[PDB]
Scaffold this active site. Structure first.
Site, mmCIF file in Angstrom:
data_model
loop_
_atom_site.group_PDB
_atom_site.id
_atom_site.type_symbol
_atom_site.label_atom_id
_atom_site.label_comp_id
_atom_site.label_asym_id
_atom_site.label_seq_id
_atom_site.Cartn_x
_atom_site.Cartn_y
_atom_site.Cartn_z
ATOM 1 N N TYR B 509 0.940 -1.103 0.000
ATOM 2 C CA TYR B 509 0.000 0.000 0.000
ATOM 3 C C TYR B 509 0.990 1.161 0.000
ATOM 4 O O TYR B 509 1.149 1.869 -0.985
ATOM 5 C CB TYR B 509 -0.845 0.080 1.264
ATOM 6 N N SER B 592 -5.206 0.220 -5.149
ATOM 7 C CA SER B 592 -5.291 1.664 -4.898
ATOM 8 C C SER B 592 -3.869 2.263 -4.802
ATOM 9 O O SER B 592 -3.044 2.034 -5.701
ATOM 10 C CB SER B 592 -6.097 1.928 -3.595
ATOM 11 N N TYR B 593 -3.576 3.000 -3.719
ATOM 12 C CA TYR B 593 -2.269 3.607 -3.577
ATOM 13 C C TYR B 593 -1.189 2.555 -3.803
ATOM 14 O O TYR B 593 -0.140 2.826 -4.414
ATOM 15 C CB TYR B 593 -2.110 4.243 -2.205
ATOM 16 N N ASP B 670 -15.475 2.783 -11.300
ATOM 17 C CA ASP B 670 -14.748 3.296 -10.159
ATOM 18 C C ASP B 670 -14.934 4.805 -10.068
ATOM 19 O O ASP B 670 -14.513 5.547 -10.939
ATOM 20 C CB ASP B 670 -13.252 2.955 -10.236
ATOM 21 N N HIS B 702 -14.469 0.901 -6.805
ATOM 22 C CA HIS B 702 -13.117 0.813 -6.257
ATOM 23 C C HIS B 702 -12.827 -0.440 -5.436
ATOM 24 O O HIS B 702 -11.669 -0.859 -5.306
ATOM 25 C CB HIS B 702 -12.834 2.065 -5.442
HETATM 26 B B1 LIG Z 1 -6.644 4.184 -2.555
HETATM 27 O O1 LIG Z 1 -5.209 4.134 -2.072
HETATM 28 O O2 LIG Z 1 -7.523 3.821 -1.401
HETATM 29 C C1 LIG Z 1 -6.983 5.648 -3.153
HETATM 30 C C2 LIG Z 1 -5.828 6.168 -3.999
HETATM 31 C C3 LIG Z 1 -4.973 6.942 -2.983
HETATM 32 C C4 LIG Z 1 -5.986 7.660 -2.171
HETATM 33 N N1 LIG Z 1 -7.130 6.716 -2.150
HETATM 34 C C5 LIG Z 1 -8.227 6.794 -1.379
HETATM 35 O O3 LIG Z 1 -9.145 6.006 -1.488
HETATM 36 C C6 LIG Z 1 -8.304 7.931 -0.356
HETATM 37 C C7 LIG Z 1 -7.295 7.727 0.757
HETATM 38 C C8 LIG Z 1 -8.134 7.905 2.056
HETATM 39 C C9 LIG Z 1 -9.463 8.566 1.653
HETATM 40 N N2 LIG Z 1 -9.636 8.078 0.278
#
Ligand SMILES: *[B]([O])([O])[C]1[C][C][C]N1C(=O)[C]1[C][C][C][N]1
Ligand SMILES: *[C@@H]1O[C@H](CO)[C@@H](O[C@@H]2O[C@H](CO)[C@@H](O[C@@H]3O[C@H](CO)[C@@H](O)[C@H](O)[C@@H]3O)[C@H](O)[C@H]2NC(C)=O)[C@H](O)[C@H]1NC(C)=O
Ligand SMILES: *[C@@H]1O[C@H](CO)[C@@H](O[C@@H]2O[C@H](CO)[C@@H](O)[C@H](O)[C@H]2NC(C)=O)[C@H](O)[C@H]1NC(C)=O
Ligand SMILES: *[C@@H]1O[C@H](CO)[C@@H](O[C@@H]2O[C@H](CO)[C@@H](O)[C@H](O)[C@H]2NC(C)=O)[C@H](O)[C@H]1NC(C)=O
Ligand SMILES: *[C@@H]1O[C@H](CO)[C@@H](O[C@@H]2O[C@H](CO)[C@@H](O)[C@H](O)[C@H]2NC(C)=O)[C@H](O)[C@H]1NC(C)=O
Ligand SMILES: *[B]([O])([O])[C]1[C][C][C]N1C(=O)[C]1[C][C][C][N]1
Ligand SMILES: *[C@@H]1O[C@H](CO)[C@@H](O)[C@H](O)[C@H]1NC(C)=O
Ligand SMILES: *[C@@H]1O[C@H](CO)[C@@H](O)[C@H](O)[C@H]1NC(C)=O
Ligand SMILES: *[C@@H]1O[C@H](CO)[C@@H](O)[C@H](O)[C@H]1NC(C)=O
Ligand SMILES: *[C@@H]1O[C@H](CO)[C@@H](O)[C@H](O)[C@H]1NC(C)=O
Ligand SMILES: *[C@@H]1O[C@H](CO)[C@@H](O)[C@H](O)[C@H]1NC(C)=O
Ligand SMILES: *[C@@H]1O[C@H](CO)[C@@H](O)[C@H](O)[C@H]1NC(C)=O
Ligand SMILES: *[C@@H]1O[C@H](CO)[C@@H](O)[C@H](O)[C@H]1NC(C)=O
Ligand SMILES: *[C@@H]1O[C@H](CO)[C@@H](O)[C@H](O)[C@H]1NC(C)=O
Lengths: 728, 728
Positions: B509, B592-593, B670, B702
């Site tokens: 992550y 995600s990240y 998404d 997502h």
């Molecule tokens: B994923 O990493 O969950 C996505 C891309 C980076 C930011 N993100 C989110 O969903 C944010 C982070 C915390 C609030 N939503």
């Protein structure tokens, strides 16, 4: 000679196939862009002359992609800044060059973003479309006279077709027809107001922060269609201080009843125009010959002058009724219609009568009429050696339908079996384009004595390069299915060792009236698979295909997804019986319809195919446009053909996919077969717990033809295939 | 022999993990749902008594997805027809049930599609948001009084948050706050008029003939953000023939100079509210404490009741500033801020002064504050054993901070190192929740006797089934990078032989203030990969991660995609040098990240990883929402930090992808990390001539959490991962 036709040889077209493009401007002279300079060629002798030196070509903005010279040869039209739209449509910028003054016209230029432009038949008038409205420039340097004011983006089209008429009814952007002498200018007006909008994302260039949503008026099976109106404008009174003089011509009563289409326009004489309409149903079309009435400006039609064409087993014509070919005097015409036996043949019609007489007959079909002098009728057919995948030029003597001769049959019997022709103005000369089975060959002929005259392009350069690389061999042949004789073709690897068992690939289209088995020469992806990967690739034309009679072609009427699919399965079986075929390593691939067919095959659960690839395939017929779909399925209602619509969806066979390896591909910008189709299909498979593969192509369209996309999709289907066949 | 944790075991949740959800309703009582009946347990003794028999739910006819009993315990709220929206938002239908007369109110019902509803803190009043407008309803059998009229889809939001506020500011959909005794109802209004719209397709059900287009006002890096306004409604005058009496509180001038956000609301007393705002930049926040003036109805703010929080090394708080916790009389409050060493500890603030006193210090951090009685302050910190991956409940004495107890550390040292708690009203009792490393254990405690009243749930069952199965081992340790020790975890296969060599899969992550390495027990995909595929699955928290001080956390400030990505490669390198690791087979994956980092790592050309998988990754920071992105990166302007916005996109590393096997996955619906991100990455890759694997999931968002989708994606990933590791 120890190397093969590689994947890169295909993708980079390292082997150039040359052609010869010319334009007839007279009855014996033609234009030909050479070394970047137009030259006037005299068909009679072969001597040429510079019509426009290169240099004079000064990269105006970009590059001169296309040019059109006015009929009186006083001006030449230059097209630049070409910006493709759909399949035929596009915009561009245009320059007009004065061949006398030898200057460039600078006052009163053609608008930027012009949609369609055209010289009048005689002289040098111009008609063009811009922002969906029509404009007439009698003289270049002078201003243009606006003809319509209703034009509106995505709603009203004057002079150009909307999406569905461009894709399925005219196969062209244009809906403008000048009279033989430039008196009248006819156009169609389209109204998409109640046509639903198909919408999808266009991500564009990486730098765009928000995706755009493309919106297109697109009628899907059974949905509201664009309406149509026809107009005949008298350009004689075109004056800045004058209203426009135009008559609106409506369809005969039999078509005007319910929904309909306008499928064709043909001027007979400066005062006689032929309109051809077809019903939404499409098993009923009618020709309406209209004559101008000098005393009222009206355009009159009559029962005596109408000719109805219908079908009881299916739809009229191949992809639309064939077009009428009138005689100079316009009192009679020739046109291809089905037999009493279902074969497409030329019938002779009398403008004011109802009976017609066929002048050709046989267990073969006429592809098209090419030219018509007061004496002969030149046409193209697949009668030679009775093989439907062949094309040849014939000339029938009008006063004796018995006197028929073949001009291309024996020229080069081995190398040339597939031809097309281009006739000069009065049919004094023609160019014969041989597209196969050997390397393409272009030649010129005199209609007077039928003499070779000379060769324009023999691809001798190509031939040279090939005899130093291991090319695959292609063989055509027939097989029997439920009684009927059917054609197939196999691309056999080089050094064909019969003791070896070769993996087999079925390349399939199989859509109504399609023809994947012919003699056209092609440097393709299969070339690489046979040549380098030692994979045999085959194609089969079964029930539903064309150029073989209605019985075979109309077979799948109202039941797409059935026979043509089954027939592919049944034929691969026979192919697998043969010994050089490793029946345990067979795949099937296809694009568009072929991607549909291919998908149905895999979901058939016949256990015949190990794997398959579907590229931008139709998955559920209620998702495809309505002109095409409804032509073979009627309406999706339980009062019509709903049941056969519901059970020919690829999703209905999702569970069987658990048995094969499937690669699904689509461009997110497909405007033809919407990405929705594959999105809906992959969702059905996920939901059936089936595992498979996908490959979306960002912003690519139905042809996934961008350079990088093109390379990538093929490189990808090859890895998937060599893995399905466990090859190195 | 013995069984191994199969993929199916993970996908169908064959092995259940029980828990104990309770809803405190007094200082000693709480509600529990057991067998579908609602018991009212008494903490002091443990004796329960049916509150609502499961006989009622059967008679309601609808599937109850949730309930809420009024604080006066006279009514109960029934939720049904639950329709999920974004991460926290949803609409639903509601019925109020009169406990007393055991009947169901049917007059003056609550609207279908209600967006949010809540009982007053006392009594049985209700407030709910319908169509972006707020409604108050004093009696369940009475009609409700409208409070706002500006409500408007995709534009004006009253009582609930718009998209970015939900996702990044409140991590909640609610935007309304009753006061202690329910005299006031404070709410925020959101204006999204200038916020651009993200648009995409939703194909929906196979029968939908045309895809619909979803539109959401979503601010991307630097775009126009929504605006906010705060109001406090004096619900005492709400009458059908009276105007709404309301005062509007505006932020302090230091926040009004530019774009700001409201990030917190906290009632202190019926006449004192605390608002917390933060500049769009987010390195400057302020808390404004406002008192109600009884003679005018206004809410007065003063420079003395204000408190500023800034960050010179980066942003404030973790994902936002920490909320304040006020003493019962509001003359002071405690809150978590960074100490001089970059460590988050509790500071004690005098509501009207500006300096504060830290009541905790050390090289560990306070996670958050859990409760506060006049004598004690309970909280959670990762102090124990000095490991940031663990959490414990502690109590500190307000008249002597040297006296701090750890109420949870020693209850089960080997089974429980990760806790959280839920205190009763007035902190008299509290439920303790242990999440690992052992099986989850829910206990109940007395706050005074510091005695464990009893086990609410010990998963005694699961522990059985888990013995007849080959569960992997989870090891936590440390390694040094650039001089600092960073934690990492590994999930070793069973019968782990230190001798042999195993394929390593890094699971990442690595987002800012993130924590992948902790002691929480998780039945997961990795448990399957380690248990059945004998694959080691490691994680590592390097620079950028949190709970270890601001130096480690703010290290990536304004340079996302650098130190965090680089450290996931260094760690992997140290891991490869441990011998039980087969460097010929190391992989990486994240969602995600983590899909971003996974992509950035793969694109580093470090040749360490063989293949990697990215699920719904951010690919270019300029595409992600503004609140989050900006918080760590500033604005994408050349004046600001635009240079790092470009060299940190994933498409800039596209060439290096030719050296690795990559799998890109994204759900087309998404709404968080738009499908555009991978469409752009895939396009950059097709353009680079890079070969790779793709997989889209139709209409999944997502989470790609629908039942069948979830299964499909982990199945698909395993198959890919197994071929990469050459596992059969
Ligand atoms: B994923 O990493 O969950 C996505 C891309 C980076 C930011 N993100 C989110 O969903 C944010 C982070 C915390 C609030 N939503
Ligand atoms: C309606 O409420 C009653 C409560 O009185 C429910 O009865 C309870 O039903 C559960 C369901 O299984 C029973 O629990 C079982 O316990 C045994 C222990 O031997 C265990 O092996 C099972 O796995 C299960 O947990 C419980 O004994 C029973 N109690 C009573 C008082 O009969 C009833 O199920 C509810 N009905 C519905 C529709 O939920
Ligand atoms: C395009 O077609 C639409 C029909 O769908 C025409 O719109 C109707 O026009 C009539 C006559 O003015 C009105 O009474 C109706 O209210 C209109 N209905 C709709 C759907 O708008 C429209 O006029 C046509 N446009 C052109 C240029 O022919
Ligand atoms: C849709 O349903 C029809 C009706 O049954 C199918 O047609 C039959 O197909 C079987 C093939 O095993 C034949 O034996 C029958 O003779 C057919 N009957 C009819 C009514 O023609 C049809 O194949 C189905 N279509 C699809 C896509 O599977
Ligand atoms: C983006 O560019 C910056 C500026 O050059 C990079 O930062 C340098 O990176 C090198 C090599 O990775 C280090 O040795 C330097 O010490 C860094 N100095 C600076 C100016 O910060 C940064 O790594 C790049 N990041 C991305 C995402 O590509
Ligand atoms: B594909 O086969 O090219 C596509 C799906 C099936 C029909 N189709 C078309 O594009 C049709 C056939 C040619 C005119 N439109
Ligand atoms: C123009 O034509 C001459 C021969 O006619 C040729 O030599 C010259 O290269 C041409 N210019 C180009 C490159 O188009
Ligand atoms: C060819 O030469 C003849 C005269 O010999 C001439 O009439 C004809 O126009 C020439 N054609 C061209 C364009 O070279
Ligand atoms: C047409 O009308 C315009 C009005 O501006 C005028 O200038 C022009 O002379 C008229 N043309 C004639 C001669 O009828
Ligand atoms: C044409 O098709 C319609 C329905 O599709 C049908 O009712 C009609 O009978 C058909 N006409 C012919 C010639 O078969
Ligand atoms: C639980 O026990 C206490 C003390 O005996 C009693 O006051 C209370 O009424 C009981 N509550 C329940 C669960 O009925
Ligand atoms: C929302 O903001 C716009 C300006 O961006 C303003 O015109 C409009 O009145 C506002 N709506 C409300 C309810 O405040
Ligand atoms: C409120 O006004 C209505 C008419 O608008 C009236 O009938 C009713 O009696 C009033 N109710 C109150 C609160 O007095
Ligand atoms: C907050 O960030 C801005 C730029 O975004 C910077 O100029 C300002 O100094 C920062 N605040 C502090 C006190 O560092």
């Amino acid at each position: 000679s120890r190397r093969t036709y590689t994947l890169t040889d295909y993708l980079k077209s390292t082997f150039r196939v040359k052609f010869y493009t010319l334009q007839w401007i007279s009855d014996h002279e033609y234009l030909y862009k050479q070394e970047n300079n137009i030259l006037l060629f005299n068909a009679e002798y072969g001597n040429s002359s510079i019509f426009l030196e290169n240099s004079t070509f000064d990269e105006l903005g970009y590059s001169t992609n296309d040019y059109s010279v006015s009929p009186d040869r006083q001006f030449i039209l230059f097209e630049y800044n070409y910006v493709k739209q759909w399949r035929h449509s596009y915009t561009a910028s245009y320059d007009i060059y004065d061949l006398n003054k030898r200057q460039l016209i600078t006052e009163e230029r053609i608008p930027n973003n012009t949609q369609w432009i055209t010289w009048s038949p005689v002289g040098h008038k111009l008609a063009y479309v811009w922002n969906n409205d029509i404009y007439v420039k009698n003289e270049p340097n002078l201003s243009s006279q606006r003809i319509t004011w209703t034009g509106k983006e995505n709603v009203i089209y004057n002079g150009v077709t909307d999406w569905v008429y461009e894709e399925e009814v005219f196969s062209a952007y244009s809906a403008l027809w000048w009279s033989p002498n430039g008196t009248f200018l006819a156009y169609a007006q389209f109204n998409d107001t109640e046509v639903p909008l198909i919408e999808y994302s266009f991500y564009s260039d990486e730098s765009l922060q928000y995706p755009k949503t493309v919106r297109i008026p697109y009628p899907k099976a059974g949905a509201e269609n664009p309406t149509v109106k026809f107009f005949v404008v008298d350009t004689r009174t075109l004056s800045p201080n004058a209203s426009v003089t135009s008559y609106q011509i409506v369809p005969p009563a039999s078509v005007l009843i319910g929904d309909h289409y306008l499928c064709g326009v043909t001027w007979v004489t400066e005062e006689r125009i032929s309109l051809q309409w077809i019903r939404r149903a499409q098993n009923y079309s009618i020709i309406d010959i209209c004559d101008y009435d000098e005393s009222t400006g009206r355009w009159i039609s009559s029962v005596a002058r109408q000719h109805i064409e219908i079908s009881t087993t299916g739809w009229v014509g191949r992809f639309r009724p064939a077009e009428p070919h009138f005689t100079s005097d316009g009192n009679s015409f020739y046109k291809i219609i089905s037999n009493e036996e279902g074969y497409k043949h030329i019938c002779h019609f009398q403008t004011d009568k109802s009976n017609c007489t066929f002048i050709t007959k046989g267990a073969w079909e006429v592809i098209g009429i090419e030219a018509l002098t007061s004496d002969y009728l030149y046409y193209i057919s697949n009668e030679h050696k009775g093989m439907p995948g062949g094309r040849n030029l014939y000339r029938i003597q009008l006063n004796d339908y018995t006197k028929v001769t073949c001009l291309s049959c024996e020229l080069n019997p081995e190398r040339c079996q597939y031809y097309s022709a281009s006739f000069s103005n009065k049919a004094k000369y023609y160019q014969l384009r041989c597209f196969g089975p050997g390397l393409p060959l272009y030649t010129l002929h005199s209609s007077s004595s039928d003499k070779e005259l000379r060769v324009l392009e023999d691809n001798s350069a190509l031939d040279k390069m090939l005899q130093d690389v291991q090319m695959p061999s292609k063989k055509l042949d027939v097989i029997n299915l439920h009684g009927t004789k059917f054609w197939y073709q196999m691309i056999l690897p080089p050094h064909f060792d019969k003791s070896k068992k070769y993996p087999l690939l079925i390349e399939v289209y199989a859509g109504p009236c399609s023809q994947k088995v012919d003699t056209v020469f092609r440097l393709s992806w299969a070339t690489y698979l046979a040549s380098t990967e030692n994979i045999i690739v085959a194609s089969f034309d079964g029930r539903g295909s064309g150029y073989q009679g209605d019985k075979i072609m109309h077979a799948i009427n109202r039941r797409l997804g059935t026979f043509e699919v089954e027939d592919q399965i049944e034929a691969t079986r026979q192919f697998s019986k043969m010994g050089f075929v490793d029946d345990k390593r067979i795949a099937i691939w296809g694009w568009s319809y072929g991607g549909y067919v291919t998908s149905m095959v895999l979901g058939a659960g016949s256990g015949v195919f190990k794997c398959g690839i579907a590229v931008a395939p139709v998955s559920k017929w209620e998702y495809y446009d309505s002109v095409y779909t409804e032509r073979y399925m009627g309406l999706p209602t339980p009062e019509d053909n709903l049941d056969y619509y519901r059970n020919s969806t690829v999703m209905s066979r999702a569970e069987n996919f658990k048995q094969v390896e499937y690669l699904l591909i689509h461009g997110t910008a497909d405007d033809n077969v919407h990405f929705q189709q594959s999105a809906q299909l992959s969702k059905a498979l996920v939901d059936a717990g089936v595992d498979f593969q996908t490959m979306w192509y960002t912003d690519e369209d139905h042809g996934i033809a961008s350079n990088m996309a093109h390379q990538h999709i093929y490189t990808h289907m090859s890895h998937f295939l060599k893995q399905c066949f466990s090859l190195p």
